[PDB]
Structures are given as structure tokens and as C-alpha cells.
Design a protein around this ligand. Structure first.
Ligand code: SRO
Lengths: 228, 256, 338, 232, 53
């Protein structure tokens, strides 16, 4: 299970560049594929291509000039960019997602390739000094309620180590991802979400992002850095 | 009056056929869906155009209804009659395909067959009848003759009879001939199938063919009008018999 | 020599019958006479799950009371989402002959078995988002008739070679073999405590097995023909059987004898499935009359009929919380009732 | 008031329905047959030019039509429970060996049981009478006598109306027609008319047998179409 | 041939089993059934507000 990406480098403004993400290790046709990161800013959603290319969504910032297609026999999906501007410099992440009852979307992320040229969510914390072996909590507020009529609260927690792609920790505010140790725990109510860590130890220091999946466009949080 | 029984017989029989299709679970198939569409077409005919024709009879062909509604009565008459005729033509063609090569018919026999057949016959019935309401509502001279509702536009009449009855007649004669040629202890059931096919085909020819022959001979040439006045009601009698001769050969409809 | 053994067996059988009859003093009818009846109930099909193009043979509710799996003759084993009526998975089967299926209590495994003599276990939750065959358990000399998960790692099977087995998935080989029947084994039902189960065979007898030792404890013979389906009372001290004589029977484990039989003259057709309600007061059933029935478990009064299938009802299951009832039939539609 | 994940799940279910539709549409093209016989009948060698203990499978094509013939040899003598599955097959193929007279009554009783089944009131049967050469040698030998087993053979009506094969022994013709009429009597005793039997005489070495099954399945489907079109 | 010994041994093993009165068994059954009378969504109807179907 891998996702490799190609393309990037210096590009003059107003030009065009093609990013290709080649998947190798999973059933590519059964997954819906999605996310960029500026040099000094948190993750920002870009676009989304469904299963079998049956549905496409874009963020308003990249509407009309970004196009996506996927070669299912080739096991690869692309991103065509035209009329690039000076503010689109970022690192683009190839992200998978599968949607059925009990699924865990956004469970794997690509490596990321550098390219250089609405629900509002805020995370109040910016930098929290922490001691090893000390329980901590991270909160992420919301504008409107995420609790749906059916009873699912659509909120996600992602973690990025330094020099690494982010990964899923908690999906739908309570359920744990696969391979995540039990110390991580999510709880709260509508419009108030907390991530609690107990027996915090090394190799757990990074940037924590909170995302909503109630409706498009998908908006991330500002992020919270942890430091010793 | 003789026309008083025909409206009641048509409205009763078509309601009975549709209720028997809806109620009996064994009669859910493609062919019975097409037959329900046929019964819908003749029930709309017997409900919409047939008491209007009785009213025209009871006033001595001086039309009581006002002049704005003449172009839609010819529209409903031609639409439902062409729907019935193309229904019988498609049924004859389907029977020829299902009798000549029964393996390859059942290989392709989805419900898409029935839905495409219904779509084709109703699209054809709409498209053939298309110059009736657009050219008759404002232009009363083409749909009136001496103060009575009749198709005075004979250029419509000849070509419309040619596409509506005579090309279906030359299709169903060929398919009936080749179906009898393809049906020549299954030998006992093939005789009953041949008898039912013969009764249905010759009853269709006897019910519809005098009216169209004298209708074309009207445009080629008051005896003709007096013949047409009763041959229209002979043509309306087919829509009460078509539920009977297409369902009563199967005992499930009689048990319903 | 063998004549003496037969004489001793007959004498001991007479002794057992006399001992079992000595404990019958008052029948359940005269005890339950002064009870307010349940009256009349009506349940309408709330959802109808389409997608199968062939007969449906078996189904099993999930533990979360929302997901269920069903098996058909077309060779597809597909999982539904009851509330929204979607399809979660569609698993292509190597053999088109499938006669039993089960949903694991953990919710991440599904079992399948049929005329191919092999019980196939499918892993649902896995990486790369596809359902791959976990293991193919083999070792039965007759067609598999029923299968039920004990835990994540063990499964009990009832085969068409006059025996049941208890498998260990990781090792992939049997750890116990239940061989007490004389006819074909057709059904099986675990207990709520998951320490002893029961089985049903074509010899008109049901046996109460034990999963620790593997020795039959009790046998119940009161049916005039093969018993097609079996359940377990939620109390865990009784169960209900169903045969092709159009008669369901209620048996008790402690009393070791039949308690009540559910029969009516208007019905002379076979029974395919039985299940209990949440409190056990209602005993459901599934007949060959293109419909179902609802039996009062304490009075044997027909207190409901669920006629919604144009073909026979093959499988039937009650939700764990008791919110709904789901029945599958040979008309390729399985409908949920409430 | 709909979540994006529910939208995507509905789209996934639509795609699954599309795949199921396509697969089911493809799977209907082929016809299905159930081959079964008592024993010592050579049911395996019915078709040999064209060609998992519980189930045996055989696939052959004639004139672009696919047939799946299903034979089960891993079951017991009592088959009343696994036969409910085979109720939508095109036709059952029955093979018997007329060479052995000692066990003819067993095969006749088996035919009675399969004819009078409750789940097979709509399936027609294609009957095969295998190993006619051995029957010919046995009857020409003059050792075995049919009156010992069947007293009704001693007084039998000459099949004058029935046309025999051009050039053959009258005693052989009498015996084989007697056996076939014995089968057909049970076939027609019910007199229901819903389904019929298709008797055939088979040689030990017979190159063509799929054509016979094709011409009987075509008749079966034609009769079904005639019945469903209200022409009968 | 020798299966009769196994059969009679099994019957002897199953002969010695404790039993109770059918009245006591029936009383326990009705007690359990009436204990969960209010916890049966099929025995008692439910309003549409709580019904998930
Ligand atoms: N009563 C109108 C019968 C009819 C059916 N199709 C027609 C086409 C042309 C025409 O003049 C008449 C018809």
C-alpha cells in the first residue's frame, strides 16, 4: 500500500503543470481520492474525485482551472493545473478515502511533492509546552454543529510528525484508526471537540489537525504544535 | 342504442384486465406489461373519444361541443387508435421472434425489451399524430367539413393511413405468414397457437380494415360518409375485443 | 450376544421413558390458562431490499442491529445497511451452490457454506478495501448445512454427513467432532452463554451438545418427520424446533421433555425457519404457504400473519435488540418487518 | 441536511448495483441442465467431444449457445433436500441402462419419484436409454427372457403404426419400444400436461448428443413462450 | 457389528440426568417472559420518533 507522486519544481506564473499520483498496493478503483499544504500554513483542501469518476468537487479557490482524471487500468490519478498564480506554492498530498457504513476515510496519505512558483474551524492552541509522561488535551472549536440527525458527528483528527505526511488518528470523533495506540481518545459534544492523550511519550510530537466532513468544502483547523 | 353497450363493455373489460394484471402475481412479465399498456390505450379511447362520438351520433353529426375542442378530439382519436394498431403490430413482431428462434429471444428477453417496446410504440403514436393539434386549433378549416369534426385535409389522411395502418398491415401479414410457416406432443399445442393467431389476425383485419379502405377511397374519389359513420364504430369495437382475444386464451385471466 | 445388548437397551429405554413421564404432573396449558392474551398485532414491511436476481437461501443479522448479510443462488454474498438500505459489500463466490451464511459477533468476519463441502470465511475489515477469502475450512464429507461463529477464532458447523464440528480458524483444522446423529444434520443454534448448543437432523430428533467435552447431553424425540430449523429461548433453558409436519414444538433443557406444540388444521405445509422475540413471548415461524406466522409462546394461538412473499420464505431472523424482523424468500426480495 | 459521507456511500451502492446488473445480465445468456442417473448407466459419457467432490461441472457449446450440465456424485442415495435448488434449470437429463433387466424397476421407481416431486412441477425431463447395443446382443443371444420379469411382454401389441428403423430385428424393436412405452406410461399417467418427457435412444459410442439436447431445449423454450403469450 | 456396544454405552451415559417438575419449568418460563414484557419492541408498538425504520 503506497502512493507515489510526480511533478513540481520551478514554474513561472500563468503557466501549466501536471501532477500525477500513482497508486501501487491496493484496489484503486474502489476508493475515492482527494489536499495541499503551504510552506508555513496548515493543510488546505483542494479537490476530490469519486469512485469510477462519478462525482467531482473542487474548492472555490481552485475552481475552473484545476482538472482531475484517473486512469483506473493504469492505477493513477492526475491533477492538471492552468493559470498558476504566485500564491499556489504548496505541497500537494495524494489522499485515499472509502465511504461505506463503518468506513475510515482519509486513512492513507501520499508522500507529497513540492510545487513552487463554509464551516470555519479554529484551534485556539498554537504551542503548548509539555512534559514526557504527562497527559495532555487538544481542543478544536467549530462554527456550526457537526452532529447529524442520524447521530454521526463528522469530525476527524490528523497527526503530522516533522518531515512526514499526516495520518488519520480519530474518525468521526470517537473511533480510532488502525494501528493507532489506545492512549489516543476523542470525546466532546456538538461544537466542542477534545483529543485527550494519556501516558504521553516520545515519537508523539507533531502538528494536530482537525477536519470536518459534514459538507464540502472540507475545512481543516489551524493546527497545534507540541514542544518539550 | 347499440353504442350504449360498447362504452360500458370497453370500460368494464379494460378495468378488469388491468385489475387482473395488478392482482394476480403470476401475470407479472414483459408481455403482460405490454398488454396492460394496450388496455390503458383502449381504456383512454373508450373513456375520452367514445361518448363524444355517441354524443355526435345523438345530435345527428351537428357537433354540440364548441369549436375549440375539435382539433384535440381528432388528436385523441388518432393517437389512441395508432397506439392500439402499433401495439398489435409490435405484439405480432415479438411473437414471430419468440416463435421462430426461441433460444435467442429468451437470451435477450429483459424488462428493457418491454420498456423499449412501449417507448417505441408511444413515440410513434405521438409522432404520427403530430400535425393534428398544432394545425387545427387556429386553423379550423382543415379539421371541419360542413360544420362537423372531420379530417378535411386529405393530404394528411392519405399519408397518415399509409404510415398508420397499411405499413403495419404489410408488416403483420408477413409476420403472420412466417409465424404460420414457423409453426409447421408440442404438435397439439402448436395447433391451438395457430388457431389463436388466426382468430386474432383475421379479427384485427375485419375490425380495422373496412374503415381505412373506405377512408382512402374517400380521398381517391353520400354513401361514403354513411359507410364511414358506422365503420368508425366498427373500428371502436376492436378496442373492446382486444382485451378478450388476447387474455382469455390463458386460464389465469379467466380465474381472476 | 447382541440380543442381550438389545434387550438391555430396550429395558433402559423403558426406564428412561418412565422416569421422564414421572416428572410430568401439570401441563403448561392449565398453568398458563389465566393469563391476559396478547390480543391482535399487525406488522407491515418497513423496508424491502432489492439487488438479488435469484433465490435467497440464508441470512444473518449483525450484532449492531443494522447490518445483515444474505446468500443467494446467483453466487453473490452481499451485505446490506438496513436503515438506509444500501449495499456495503458484494463478495463473488467461487461456488454458486450456497446454503448457509453467518455474520461474526465482532462484525469483521463472514462465513459461507454450501454443496461444495467447504466453509469459506471472509475478512471484511482489511487494508486495500476489498474482501478477500481469509480461509477455506475443509474436512466434511457431506454438504454444509449451517455455520455459526462462536468467537472471532472459532466456528461451529453442521454438515450433511451426520455430524457437526467445531473449528479453530487460525490452525484451520477441527478441534472437536460431534457425531451422535443417525440422519442428515440440517440446522444448529448456539446458546446465549456460548457454552452449549443444540442441533437438528432429518431423523426427527434434536440433540443438546456441549462445546467443551463434545458429548451429547440430552436428546428430544417428539417429531413425526425431519426438523428443518431450530432456535434457542433467550432464557437459555428452552428452544423451539420446526419440521415439515406443519408443527413447531417447544422443548426444555432442564425438564428434558416437550412442553407445547404449535399446530393448526388450516396449515399442512412445511416449516423453514423459526425465531424468538426479545422477551420470548412471541415465537415466529416461516412456512411453505408463501407467508409466515406469529405464535404466542404460552398459548399456541396464532396472533399474527405476515403474508408479503409470492414464493416460500426460506430464512428468518430477529434483530438482537428486537427492533425489527427480517425474512428472506425465493422471490429474490428479503423484507424487514416491525 | 445530508452528510457528504452518506452521499458517497449512496454513490458506492449505485456503483455496486450497476456491477450486479452487468454481471446478472451477462450470467443469464447460458442455459442450465441437471444430469442424474441411478447407477451403471454411463451418464458421464453422454457428451465427450466437448468438455470439489460435492459438485461436478461440465460446459459445452453448440451453435453459439452455452450449456452448464451439473452432476452431483458426492451425495447419499436420499436426495430430497439438495434437489430443491434445481427448480429453475432448463431441463433434467435422466439416463438409464436398459441392458440390465434386474434393476429396471429401481430406475422406473426413481423416475416416478422425480416426476411426482413437489418442487419439479414445472421442469421437463429429457430421458436417455443408454447401452442399446448390449441390449441387442442380450436379446439376440436368447438366454434372458422378459416374461420372467415383465409378464406383460408375453402378450404385446405389434407396433405396426410406429415406424421402425430401416433394417432391424422385429424382436429387438418390440423389446425397445416396450421399454420406452413403459417409461412413457409413467410419464403420462399424471396427465397434468404442464411438462413432458423427451425419450431418446443412445448408443455406447455416439458422436452427436449435444444436438439432441439443443433441439429439446429449443422445444422447451418455445413451449414456454407459447404458454406465456396466451396462445395455449 | 460392534456399534451396539457404543450405542448402549451412550444411552447408559445419558440415562442418569437430573430433571425438574414441568410446573417449575413453566413457572420459570412465564417469569422470564413477563420480566421483559416492557423491553420487547415487537410485542408493544413504538412511536415513529423513536422507531429507526
Ligand atoms: N378514428 C381515427 C382513426 C385513425 C387512426 N389512425 C389514423 C390515421 C389517419 C386517419 O385519417 C385516421 C386514423
Amino acid at each position: 500500500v503506497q502512493l507515489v507522486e510526480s511533478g513540481g519544481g520551478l514554474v513561472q506564473p500563468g503557466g501549466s503543470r501536471k501532477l500525477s499520483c500513482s497508486a501501487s498496493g491496493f484496489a484503486f478503483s474502489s476508493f475515492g481520492m482527494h489536499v495541499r499544504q503551504a510552506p508555513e500554513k496548515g493543510l488546505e483542501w483542494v479537490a476530490y474525485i469519486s469512485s469510477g469518476s462519478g462525482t467531482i468537487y473542487y474548492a472555490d479557490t481552485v475552481k475552473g482551472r484545476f482538472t482531475i482524471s484517473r486512469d483506473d487500468p493504469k492505477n493513477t490519478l492526475f491533477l492538471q493545473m492552468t493559470s498558476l498564480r504566485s500564491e499556489d506554492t504548496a505541497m500537494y498530498y495524494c489522499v485515499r478515502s472509502i465511504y461505506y457504513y463503518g468506513s475510515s476515510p482519509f486513512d492513507f496519505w501520499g508522500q507529497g511533492t513540492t510545487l513552487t512558483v463554509d464551516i470555519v474551524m479554529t484551534q485556539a492552541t498554537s504551542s503548548v509546552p509539555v512534559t514526557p509522561g504527562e497527559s495532555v488535551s487538544i481542543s478544536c472549536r467549530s462554527s456550526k454543529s457537526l452532529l447529524h440527525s442520524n447521530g454521526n458527528t463528522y469530525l476527524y483528527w490528523f497527526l503530522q510528525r516533522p518531515g512526514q505526511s499526516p495520518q488519520l488518528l480519530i474518525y468521526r470523533m470517537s473511533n480510532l484508526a488502525s494501528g493507532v495506540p489506545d492512549r489516543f481518545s476523542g470525546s466532546g459534544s456538538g461544537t466542542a471537540f477534545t483529543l485527550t492523550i494519556s501516558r504521553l511519550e516520545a515519537e508523539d510530537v507533531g502538528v494536530y489537525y482537525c477536519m470536518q466532513h459534514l459538507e464540502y468544502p472540507l475545512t481543516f483547523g489551524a493546527g497545534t504544535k507540541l514542544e518539550l | 342504442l347499440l353504442t350504449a353497450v360498447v362504452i360500458i363493455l370497453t370500460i368494464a373489460g379494460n378495468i378488469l384486465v388491468i385489475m387482473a394484471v395488478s392482482l394476480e402475481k403470476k401475470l407479472q412479465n414483459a408481455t403482460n406489461y405490454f398488454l396492460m399498456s394496450l388496455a390503458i390505450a383502449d381504456m383512454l379511447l373508450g373513456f375520452l373519444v367514445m361518448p363524444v362520438s355517441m354524443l355526435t351520433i345523438l345530435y345527428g353529426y351537428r357537433w354540440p361541443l364548441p369549436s375549440k375542442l375539435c382539433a384535440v378530439w381528432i388528436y385523441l382519436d388518432v393517437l389512441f387508435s395508432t397506439a392500439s394498431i402499433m401495439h398489435l403490430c409490435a405484439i405480432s413482431l415479438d411473437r414471430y421472434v419468440a416463435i421462430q428462434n426461441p433460444i435467442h429471444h429468451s437470451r435477450f428477453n429483459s424488462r428493457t425489451k418491454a420498456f423499449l417496446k412501449i417507448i417505441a410504440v408511444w413515440t410513434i403514436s405521438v409522432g404520427i399524430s403530430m400535425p393534428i393539434p398544432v394545425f387545427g386549433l387556429q386553423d379550423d378549416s382543415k379539421v371541419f367539413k360542413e360544420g362537423s369534426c372531420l379530417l378535411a385535409d386529405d393530404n394528411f389522411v392519405l399519408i397518415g393511413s399509409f404510415v398508420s395502418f397499411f405499413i403495419p398491415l404489410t408488416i403483420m401479414v408477413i409476420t403472420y405468414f412466417l409465424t404460420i410457416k414457423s409453426l409447421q406432443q408440442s404438435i397439439s399445442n402448436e395447433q391451438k397457437a395457430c388457431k389463436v393467431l388466426g382468430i386474432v389476425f383475421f379479427l384485427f383485419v375485419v375490425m380495422w380494415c373496412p374503415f381505412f379502405i373506405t377512408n382512402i377511397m374517400a380521398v381517391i374519389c353520400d354513401v361514403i360518409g354513411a359507410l364511414l359513420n358506422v365503420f368508425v364504430w366498427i373500428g371502436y369495437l376492436s378496442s373492446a375485443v382486444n382485451p378478450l382475444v388476447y387474455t382469455l386464451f390463458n386460464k389465469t385471466y379467466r380465474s381472476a | 450376544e447382541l440380543d442381550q445388548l438389545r434387550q438391555e437397551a430396550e429395558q433402559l429405554k423403558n426406564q428412561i421413558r418412565d422416569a421422564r413421564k414421572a416428572c410430568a404432573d401439570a401441563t403448561l396449558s392449565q398453568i398458563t390458562n389465566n393469563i391476559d392474551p396478547v390480543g391482535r398485532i399487525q406488522m407491515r414491511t418497513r423496508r424491502t431490499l432489492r439487488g438479488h436476481l435469484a433465490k435467497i437461501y440464508a441470512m444473518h443479522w449483525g450484532t449492531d442491529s443494522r447490518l445483515l448479510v444474505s446468500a443467494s443462488q446467483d453466487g453473490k454474498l452481499i451485505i446490506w445497511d438496513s436503515y438506509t438500505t444500501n449495499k456495503v459489500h458484494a463478495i463473488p463466490l467461487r461456488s454458486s451452490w450456497v446454503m448457509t451464511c453467518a455474520y461474526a459477533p465482532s462484525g469483521n468476519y463472514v462465513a459461507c457454506g454450501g454443496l461444495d463441502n467447504i466453509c469459506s470465511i471472509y475478512n471484511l475489515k482489511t487494508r486495500e478495501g476489498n474482501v478477500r477469502v481469509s480461509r477455506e475450512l475443509a474436512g466434511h464429507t457431506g454438504y454444509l448445512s449451517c455455520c455459526r461463529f462462536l468467537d472471532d477464532n472459532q466456528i461451529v458447523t453442521s454438515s450433511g454427513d451426520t455430524t457437526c464440528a467445531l473449528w479453530d480458524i487460525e490452525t484451520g483444522q477441527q478441534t472437536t467432532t460431534f457425531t451422535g446423529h443417525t440422519g442428515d444434520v440440517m440446522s444448529l443454534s448456539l446458546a446465549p452463554d456460548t457454552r452449549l448448543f443444540v442441533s437438528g437432523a432429518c431423523d426427527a430428533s434434536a440433540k443438546l451438545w456441549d462445546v467443551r467435552e463434545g458429548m451429547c447431553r440430552q436428546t428430544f424425540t417428539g417429531h413425526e418427520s425431519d426438523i428443518n430449523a431450530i432456535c434457542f429461548f433467550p432464557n437459555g433453558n428452552a428452544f423451539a424446533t420446526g419440521s415439515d409436519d406443519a408443527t413447531c414444538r417447544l422443548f426444555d433443557l432442564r425438564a428434558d421433555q416437550e412442553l407445547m406444540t404449535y399446530s393448526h388444521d388450516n396449515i399442512i405445509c412445511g416449516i423453514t425457519s423459526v425465531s424468538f422475540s426479545k422477551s420470548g413471548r412471541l415465537l415466529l415461524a416461516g412456512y411453505d404457504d408463501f407467508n409466515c406466522n406469529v405464535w404466542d409462546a404460552l398459548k399456541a394461538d396464532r396472533a399474527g400473519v405476515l403474508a408479503g412473499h409470492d414464493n416460500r420464505v426460506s430464512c428468518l431472523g430477529v434483530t438482537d435488540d428486537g427492533m425489527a424482523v427480517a425474512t428472506g424468500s425465493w422471490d429474490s426480495f428479503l423484507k424487514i418487518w416491525n | 441536511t445530508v452528510s457528504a459521507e452518506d452521499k458517497a456511500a449512496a454513490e458506492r451502492s449505485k456503483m455496486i448495483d450497476k456491477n450486479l446488473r452487468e454481471d446478472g445480465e451477462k450470467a443469464r445468456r447460458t442455459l442450465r441442465l441437471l444430469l442424474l442417473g441411478a447407477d451403471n448407466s454411463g451418464k458421464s459419457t453422454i457428451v465427450k467431444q466437448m468438455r470439489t467432490s460435492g459438485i461436478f461441472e461440465t460446459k459445452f457449446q453448440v451453435d453459439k449457445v452455452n450449456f452448464h450440465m451439473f452432476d452431483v456424485g458426492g451425495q447419499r442415495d436420499e436426495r430430497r433436500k439438495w434437489i430443491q435448488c434445481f427448480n429453475d434449470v432448463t431441463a433434467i437429463i435422466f439416463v438409464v441402462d436398459s441392458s440390465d433387466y434386474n434393476r429396471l424397476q429401481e430406475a422406473l421407481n426413481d423416475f416416478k419419484s422425480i416426476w411426482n416431486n413437489r418442487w419439479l412441477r414445472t421442469i421437463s425431463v429429457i430421458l436417455f436409454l443408454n447401452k442399446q447395443d448390449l441390449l441387442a446382443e442380450k436379446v439376440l443371444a436368447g438366454k434372458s427372457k422378459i416374461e420372467d420379469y415383465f409378464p406383460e411382454f408375453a402378450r404385446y401389441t405389434t407396433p405396426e403404426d410406429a415406424t421402425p428403423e430401416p433394417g432391424e430385428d422385429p424382436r429387438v424393436t418390440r423389446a425397445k419400444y416396450f421399454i420406452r412405452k413403459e417409461f412413457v406410461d409413467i410419464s403420462t399417467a399424471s396427465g397434468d400436461g404442464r411438462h413432458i418427457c423427451y425419450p431418446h435412444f443412445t448408443c455406447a459410442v455416439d458422436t452427436e448428443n449435444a444436438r439432441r439436447i439443443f433441439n429439446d431445449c429449443k422445444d422447451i423454450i418455445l413451449q414456454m413462450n407459447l404458454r406465456e403469450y396466451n396462445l395455449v | 457389528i460392534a456399534q451396539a456396544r457404543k450405542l448402549v454405552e451412550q444411552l447408559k451415559m445419558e440415562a442418569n440426568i437430573d430433571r425438574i417438575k414441568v410446573s417449575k419449568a413453566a413457572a420459570d418460563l412465564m417469569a422470564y417472559c413477563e420480566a421483559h414484557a416492557k423491553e420487547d419492541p415487537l410485542l408493544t408498538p413504538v412511536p415513529a420518533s423513536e422507531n429507526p425504520f
